Amino acid sequence: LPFTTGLIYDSVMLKHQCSCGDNSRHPEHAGRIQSIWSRLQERGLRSQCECLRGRKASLEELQSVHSERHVLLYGTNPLSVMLPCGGVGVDTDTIWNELHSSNAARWAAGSVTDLAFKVASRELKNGFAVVRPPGHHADHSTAMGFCFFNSVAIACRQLQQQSKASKILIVDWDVHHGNGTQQTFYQDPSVLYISLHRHDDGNFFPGSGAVDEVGAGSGEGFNVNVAWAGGLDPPMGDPEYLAAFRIVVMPIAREFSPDLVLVSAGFDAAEGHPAPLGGYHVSAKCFGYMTQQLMNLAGGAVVLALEGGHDLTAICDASEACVAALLGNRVDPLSEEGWKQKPNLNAIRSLEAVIRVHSKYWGCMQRL
Ligand SMILES: CN1CCC(CNC(=O)c2cccc(-c3noc(C(F)(F)F)n3)c2)(c2nc(-c3ccccc3)cs2)CC1
Ligand SMILES: [K+]
Ligand SMILES: [K+]
Ligand SMILES: [Zn+2]
Ligand SMILES: [Zn+2]
């Protein structure tokens, strides 16, 4: 393998679909990764990477994060809940194809893990995993919010257990809180979880991720929720997310000083997601710039994994900008008016609350 960025993709993950067929009623659809994949080729980025198929996560790998009941239920074939549309699912949004969902879920976990390992060995510089279904809502014994196995969490646990990375930063910029990821690593100080999400007083899915939630035991202070409050007006976008990176994410990340960075890279904070899917206005350029900023950490050992994002062009724009950043292309911050705008008052109060809480734990948060 050459020292460039790696891309993970495989058609096996397309097969995760409800039997009723309707991609509108079930918006977490195959087209999401399919369109990103062809977009990377159309724009000439795909051929510059090393393209990898990935693999099934083993039952053992799944059990490093999930319970035995959970893994039997979603990880294995029966032989070895009803929905309004007639298909089967765990709940109304989280569907279950009785032939393919388990396979596709295990592939997503397995492939994010395989990519992280290749990056951790410096066999690959960095990587982007174009996977579905998403993972960050799946917790120890609950599939929910379109998620079955927490691929990023499973990848992180394996890197640790195989001794391939001492300290791991997990950044989650999907607009929803990664409740699963927070839970798994809540008491482990060798994993730093930083989420930027729409919180709005706990009235936005999943409802978790309050600024107060800092971790526990040895892991106190190693869970950082940039929980945006105040709602959609004034608009939430680049000024606020750039501000979050300048003030919270990067300084804490640098103080932590990880050996590898994992990114739960959802693109549902992007333009084209209305309320109540997202309602935020983060541009593709900003996503690629955030990737570029995370590439300064951990000797450039960075792995992104697709979580959420529905609007096809928006998630294609963003994914394109992240891969370009991974390949070394740089974003000039002076090339965009609007990045000159101060962040809105809701974002400033949100960050102010994050700083008040985490000044107990981090020197870079301890002001006068
Ligand atoms: C149809 N009806 C009204 C529209 C509906 C609203 N969604 C939610 O309320 C909702 C609830 C739980 C979880 C999530 C969610 N969004 O991203 C993620 C992920 F895990 F990050 F990928 N989870 C979203 C939509 N969901 C999506 C969607 C598309 C791709 C991935 C996830 C959700 C588009 S519209 C679902 C229920
Ligand atoms: K998040
Ligand atoms: K932690
Ligand atoms: Zn259906
Ligand atoms: Zn999301």
Curated annotation (Swiss-Prot):
Region annotation (Histone deacetylase) ranges: 1-332
Compartment list: Nucleus; Cytoplasm
Active site: H137
Modification comment: May be phosphorylated by CaMK1. Phosphorylated by the PKC kinases PKN1 and PKN2, impairing nuclear import.
Residues the record lists as binding Zn(2+): C18, C20, H26, C85
Phosphoserine modified-residue sites: S80
Residues flagged as site, Contributes to catalysis: H310
Function as written in the Swiss-Prot or TrEMBL entry: Responsible for the deacetylation of lysine residues on the N-terminal part of the core histones (H2A, H2B, H3 and H4). Histone deacetylation gives a tag for epigenetic repression and plays an important role in transcriptional regulation, cell cycle progression and developmental events. Histone deacetylases act via the formation of large multiprotein complexes. Involved in muscle maturation by repressing transcription of myocyte enhancer factors such as MEF2A, MEF2B and MEF2C. During muscle differentiation, it shuttles into the cytoplasm, allowing the expression of myocyte enhancer factors.
Family to which this protein belongs: Belongs to the histone deacetylase family. HD type 2 subfamily.
Assembly and binders: Interacts with HDAC1, HDAC2, HDAC3, HDAC4, HDAC5, NCOR1, NCOR2, SIN3A, SIN3B, RBBP4, RBBP7, MTA1L1, SAP30 and MBD3. Interacts with KAT5 and EDNRA. Interacts with the 14-3-3 protein YWHAE, MEF2A, MEF2B and MEF2C. Interacts with ZMYND15. Interacts with KDM5B. Interacts with PML. Interacts with FOXP3. Interacts with RARA.
Protein name, as recorded: Histone deacetylase 7
Organism annotation: Homo sapiens
Gene that this sequence comes from: HDAC7
Full-protein positions shown: 516 to 901 of 952
